Design a protein around this nucleic acid. Structure first.
Lengths: 57, 247, 49, 92
RNA sequence: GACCAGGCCCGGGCGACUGUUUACCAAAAACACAGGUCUCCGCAAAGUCGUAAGACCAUGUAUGGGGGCUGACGCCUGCC
RNA sequence: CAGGGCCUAAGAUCAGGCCGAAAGGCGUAGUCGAUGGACAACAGGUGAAUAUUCCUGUACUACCCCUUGUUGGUCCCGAGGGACGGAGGAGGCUAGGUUAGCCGAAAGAUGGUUAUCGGUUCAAGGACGCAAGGUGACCCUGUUUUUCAGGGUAAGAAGGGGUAGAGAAAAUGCCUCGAGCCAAUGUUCGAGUACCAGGCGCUACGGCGCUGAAGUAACCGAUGCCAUACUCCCAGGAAAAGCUCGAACGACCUUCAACAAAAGGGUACCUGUACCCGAAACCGACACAGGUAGGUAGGUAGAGAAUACCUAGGGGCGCGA
RNA sequence: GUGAAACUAAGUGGAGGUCCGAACCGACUGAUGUUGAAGAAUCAGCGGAUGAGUUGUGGUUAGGGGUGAAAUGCCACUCG
């Protein structure tokens, strides 16, 4: 059997369909969350992925 | 001949139960895909003959269905009655004589006849008495109504200009086809139902304590509080078309 | 006249035969790519396992 | 009208050559040479910007992204043109 | 001849049985089950979620769809 | 090659439309949405880090140009098809394995012995074609009906083809011609002036350089192909595009414009490509005795993917005495 | 075997919520381990293993709730 571990190896595409910027901007509630993120000063207001490339580092 | 291009394809997915996603028609899920059969309830081609070539098993029904051709180039499915000889010819119409398998409006026929597929008003597809042996009889007619004894022990005066497929609908032997494999209930997309005594008081009103709990309430109730014996769930003023309940 | 018709139907049989066998062998190659077992270098190196 | 996929300031579509030893291996062994281009570039826009500014028929344009962000382009010229005689003129 | 590879029988209680159940002290005699019975429902059905529009029921039509209890099978199920 | 430039499922968002303090809820067209459907590359070499991607060989897709015909063509529409279940066992073979033949080497300080040790490899694709496999309709004769021997039918297969109805295609009804059909496997080309045992010359002793023999047969036998092939059962087994066929109606362009081919050349859209992936790199806070979908399945003993020991390949588990 | 039935040798067949047992899923007993190698495991056996199976990917129901073969179980090591 497995352990009581919660996060696993789910694709970042499906994590970006739920917690990404689009479903965060498709509601009044989620854009109010982005009022609180931009009002606080977070450098990364979402946790996303990209349809083209991985990372520029 | 399977894949008739009349099986009509796309459906709502299986034996669904989701309105907004909440369980609202309980104990559903499982089984095959069960692709439906778009059959011809309201026969829109009157006074043209049509043979019977195939008795196909509809998984959506309790009975069978049958593939009927025409003299013109078409294919339909209809509910075949008891006594569907292979190759026999059925024909809808207004003055077509009475045969086990054809359709006609409810006026041009005698009284005291076995009919399965009747209409409750004009224009609809087909409503009443279309199960695997559901047979409706006719008591005598009236000016614009017709007292019809449908297979519940229930009579109903109805609009006389309604289509009706005369015949006793077949596959009666599902009264005795036992489900004795005991997991064949799950093959029909029917999950097991839990019982009200063995639940908790947050779930069912008969959530008990120690032991096999007696029913406790003054009446055996549903899981939403209404009494589940004798309490007729019917609006007091809808139609007043039924003569006597007779039940 | 009839044998030339049998050669035209035979030529239809050769053309449709080459098309159907081409589609069948390419779809077998796609069925073996999709499982991850097609290229004979990756099988010939794994003949010992 | 013949539109490209994106209008991308064609006199800046190439940035710099690559002067590693493996690039000279690609010159002497492949008749190819190495450029650094921006991410917004094509196998149709770079390939046109070689047959015009240089004057050489280019055979293929094998591009790749590099994880520091910028894009790397192996351009292989035709057999008729040596990359060594056209790379010493630039300074390789 | 190594590794590997059924211990069995005689009684009784419960649950017919294969399954499911308290992730991290309870796998059970508990739940489910096939089967039985009562009861509601004639389609603009009942029932369920929602102020509503509406959706499941159901692109189905009482040999069907809910809900209560009991739990295969065999004998029955008394009185008020 | 894997996704996007193609298509849809569950589902999401839903123009208008209905509803609702607000936010929004329901819902149709439409559009997204792969875990699916459609579509074209394999072998050898290179290489501190890349290989179906780079080099060389043979290919295949999708358009243009070059030659023959056509005056209509494209899209929307009408249709076929895509197109699908589970279980079962029997065939025909390939992949692998063993043995034998062939080729090269071998004295491995032991009583004998060569009985020993290594190779015996080749893909995609292009052509030709299939039986002792399945399918091909009915009856008699011989045999266990069966594999086959023999006669008749004018439809009785894969398939085409005519019509008839409002009937272009299709579907349905009628008539006619066709004894064959289907697919793995197979021979040749690709394909040897490749690969390969060995010896030959220097070591930065890490390998490079020249030359190169045989490269066949049989027995087993797949969980892989035929194969969505048959048989049985109920619990009855997605959709759309690509593809093919086609009249009317509807939008646009028309002659060196459009369409269909036959050889021959030209052209080749974005992203992913390292590395770990039965894990020290992922998830368990750890370089954690745990977990993680899928593919390849060698020898002997064994029914076997258990087990015991081993080839390939990889380790000796990061405190020792 | 009788004019047909009822029924039985014998093959053929491969059904099963069949049996033994791997992968896989689950956790019955015992020991270890309790500042554990591990906030639930190791070792030795154990139950199912063609199904009411298991699992990947993309989804669905969201807290006066969901879901529950029903344990107050589970809903991110948290759930009256």
């Amino acid at each position: 059997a497995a352990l009581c571990l919660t996060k696993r190896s789910r694709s970042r595409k499906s994590l970006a369909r739920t917690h990404g910027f689009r479903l965060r901007m498709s509601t009044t509630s989620g854009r109010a969350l982005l009022k609180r993120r931009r009002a606080k000063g977070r450098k990364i207001l979402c946790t996303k992925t990209n349809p083209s490339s991985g990372k520029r580092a | 001949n399977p894949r008739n291009n009349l099986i009509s394809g796309q459906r709502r997915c299986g034996k669904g139960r989701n309105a907004r996603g909440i369980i609202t028609a309980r104990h559903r899920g499982g089984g095959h895909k069960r692709l439906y059969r778009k059959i011809d309830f309201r026969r829109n081609e009157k006074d043209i003959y049509g043979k019977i070539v195939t008795i196909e098993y509809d998984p959506n029904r309790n009975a069978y269905i049958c593939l009927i051709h025409y003299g013109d180039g078409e294919k339909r499915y209809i509910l075949h009655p008891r006594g569907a000889i292979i190759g026999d010819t059925i024909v809808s119409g207004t003055e077509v004589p009475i045969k086990m398998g054809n359709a006609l409006p409810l006026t041009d026929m005698p009284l005291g006849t076995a009919i399965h597929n009747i209409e409750i008003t004009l224009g609809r597809g087909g409503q009443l008495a279309r199960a695997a042996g559901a047979v409706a009889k006719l008591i005598a007619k009236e000016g614009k109504s017709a007292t019809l004894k449908l297979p519940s022990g229930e009579v109903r005066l109805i609009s006389k200009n309604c289509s009706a497929t005369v015949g006793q609908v077949g596959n009666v032997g599902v009264n005795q086809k036992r489900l004795g494999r005991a997991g064949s209930k799950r093959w029909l997309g029917k999950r097991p139902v839990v019982r009200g005594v063995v639940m908790n008081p947050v779930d069912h009103p008969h959530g008990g304590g120690e032991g096999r709990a007696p029913i406790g309430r003054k009446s055996p109730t549903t899981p939403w509080g209404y009494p589940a014996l004798g309490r007729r769930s019917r609006k007091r003023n809808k139609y007043s078309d039924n003569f006597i309940i007779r039940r | 006249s009839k044998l030339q018709l049998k050669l035209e139907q035979k030529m239809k049989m050769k053309m449709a035969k080459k098309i159907r066998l081409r589609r069948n062998r390419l779809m077998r190659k796609r069925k073996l790519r999709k499982r991850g077992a097609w290229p004979p270098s990756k099988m010939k190196k794994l003949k010992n396992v | 009208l013949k539109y490209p996929r994106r209008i991308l300031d064609v006199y800046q579509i190439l940035q710099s050559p690559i002067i590693t030893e493996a690039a000279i291996k690609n010159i002497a062994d492949e008749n190819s040479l190495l450029f650094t281009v921006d991410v917004r570039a094509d196998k149709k826009m770079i390939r046109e910007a070689i047959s015009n500014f240089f004057g050489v028929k280019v055979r293929k344009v094998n591009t790749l992204i590099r994880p520091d962000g910028t894009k790397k382009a192996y351009i292989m010229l035709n057999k008729e043109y040596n990359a060594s005689e056209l790379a010493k003129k630039i300074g390789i």
